[PDB]
Ligand binder design. Sequence first.
Ligand code: SF4
Ligand code: SF4
Ligand code: FES
Ligand code: FES
Lengths: 213, 692
Amino acid sequence: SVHRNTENNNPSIPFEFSPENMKRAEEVIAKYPPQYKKAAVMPLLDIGQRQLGYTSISVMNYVAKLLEMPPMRVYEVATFYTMYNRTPMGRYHLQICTTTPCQLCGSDGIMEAVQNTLNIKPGETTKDNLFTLSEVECLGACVNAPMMAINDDYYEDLTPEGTVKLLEDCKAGKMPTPGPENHVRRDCEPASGQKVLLSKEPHNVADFLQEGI
Amino acid sequence: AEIELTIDGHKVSIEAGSALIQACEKAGVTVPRYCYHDKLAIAGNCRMCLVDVERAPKPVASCAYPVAPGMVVRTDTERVKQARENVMEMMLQNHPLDCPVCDQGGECDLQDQSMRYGRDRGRFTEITGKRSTEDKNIGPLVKTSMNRCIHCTRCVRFANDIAGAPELGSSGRGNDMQIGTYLEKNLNTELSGNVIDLCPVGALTNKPYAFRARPWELKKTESIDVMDAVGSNIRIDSKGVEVMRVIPRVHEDVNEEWINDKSRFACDGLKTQRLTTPLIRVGDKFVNATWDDALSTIAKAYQQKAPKGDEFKAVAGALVEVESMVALKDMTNALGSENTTTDTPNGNSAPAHGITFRSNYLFNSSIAGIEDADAILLVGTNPRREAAVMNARIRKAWLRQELEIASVGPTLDATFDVAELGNTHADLEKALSGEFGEVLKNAKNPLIIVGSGITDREDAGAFFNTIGKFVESTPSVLNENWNGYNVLQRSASRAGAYDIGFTPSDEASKTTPKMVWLLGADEVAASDIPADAFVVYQGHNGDVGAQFADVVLPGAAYTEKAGTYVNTEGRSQISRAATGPPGGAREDWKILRAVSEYLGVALPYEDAYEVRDRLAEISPSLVRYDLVEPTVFGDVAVQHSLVGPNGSVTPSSAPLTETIENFYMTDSISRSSPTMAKSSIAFNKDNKKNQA
Ligand code: SF4
Ligand code: SF4
Ligand code: FES
Ligand code: FES
């Protein structure tokens, strides 16, 4: 929650934008009123996290110069949020949930299977710059309860025996899942099968009117 | 337009839309708090001003609840009496056990607050314990132990909004919240040290006065700051021999309970390089001597040199007493020579404007009028440097109302938004007729503000003659109830000196003297002094002025004497003496009395009251203390300022360079104090003091 000025993180190390990233940032700033031109400080740094793999200090200085701001506001906003990760991580960011709905369906064995297939602590990263563990709280996918998150794709409904498959799968390079779980249910469907809404067609509101319109 | 309500039976009326905590202050019912402040923005972080409100489901904070009519305010509900103990107990479970090492021992607002309303016990007895926080180096001025911080936000809102250094900030959630740059970079705004009077715990405290004393040992004395044009109303904390620290006592107009940084840490030079005995030159060597022998050498070398007229140079300095300069002027003109000149370069003449018509050398609007200001322009100055209290007023005005500032001359970094115009008096004259002859005619309560550094320039008079025309030309800037011409000084005393009539004549400006009188006045050079001149220094410490001298005279500094000072506003203010003059130093005018006695000069006084009557003779506005009068002579004063230096001054293209070299190195005490040496080195373009 602070910064060390040692190496690869300096105000002096340079950072620029890709021109596609530059044009995208210029697209984002126009979405807001020009009086609050600083109000785009959240997703703009996101673009930095897309360009450089972690939130450096240099990207924050560059955005504060870009938005005509004192740098401490950028410092505050990217400190106050979880996702702007200020340390260099591996290629694959493990975001394994720990919250009780994930836990009651056994997220413990999930994490233990991961860090026994790897050998690292939940703040520690893999020394090959491949996998970076992170425990995280309920990511909104609570119904599909044993889940996790590769960088954007939540992987759901995991058995810990089947999970270490996915772990060494991503370790091989070119093998993630398609994005959903292990091809069971769907996302909202029951574990057995679709009970309600077994109609092939949308019933229309065109007759279902108030009659006073 | 006002609202009357009931706090604990006490009916009280207050202006509408205000905060409830001010109504509690007005009613006399004391409500404790941690993060309310008058001059700051309101955040309800402290949770202390909890109070019972009829038509409220829960007790609410009194700091941010707005005043509504028909209000019944109760403070002694058992729910509220429960709540205050609750919140105190919640606060005291991560604050660390530092009460015998914390600086604010008796002055911990939290602590006295936790005696009335605190719990008996505290059931922190957890095993694995409190949080803990990094050391957080900031600078050589502000001692910092962030472990004792409670995130009361009172630091950061101030340095954000009014001090204008937005480097402070809150970083992290929960107990991972910290205060400050996590670069570990140097903070500096030109009122930097004002946060250590402001953090109510000893998280931020005083670095040179770190552990030297402790606020029940202290003798307090209300007095006046010098080395500052505003003369802020301060309080001296003294153990009884030395001077421990200074804290700004509250005053509405002149400082609004703030103080300059250099005003704060100046006590170091007040105790380390002082003149303690008279030293006579042997020839490349000073030896100390009998206090008779010094003044007898003065009389003897007077009989040797014999300056019969226009050869007795008398120069005073930046932090010198009005009451002492009275004795000076009396001695020089009973001696028979008005070679009576200021320390400033281009001080060897009159300062290119009228010593008459006090408006010519004072601040003609009120400092309170700057809240009502509209659109002003600085010339030849850095008001961030000179009178940083003024800069606080400027930034408060610029945030509050809608304003327009121009800046002509040196390119400064303001806290606010400047608009530069040029670096030439021709560029200035282009700017007056360019667009602001319309704006300042348009503006309702503007002003126009002038630093004293232009007095250094020999082309000052035409520099006056343009601006003296403009005030004459525009009746908006020159109306009855205020006057827009506003000048500042670099000292707390050259305004008082210009009340004295401390100016040489045109005849007195010509002859090289034989007997130079130093009274403070550090910034003379070897060029400003004749070769064989008799150069007796009278001061408090050892500076350049004492280095050239023949005999030095230890006079008391601004602390030890019953001083009298006049700011640029014109407030005559008493400096109550906090201690006696140490060693063999004496008071200044008492020295000048004996120096008169060993000559033929008989000063008609021997006491303080007789000086007060002589000072009433020079000007009765200086015995009528600390009450600002306006000037009924606006137009005649501006016109007489115009007519004098009219035409004869030919303005060159000299660029309007900076008045001072560094802020924290001036006035013989910032050079005396080692804390301002180490302040000076850390404060120029350093990577911790840089922004990007
Ligand atoms: S601020 Fe310091 S002195 Fe005051 S209660 Fe806290 S630790 Fe003790
Ligand atoms: S830095 Fe000091 S004044 Fe500011 S919030 Fe923290 S403890 Fe309070
Ligand atoms: S409950 Fe853990 S992710 Fe939804
Ligand atoms: S000041 Fe009232 S709650 Fe903090």
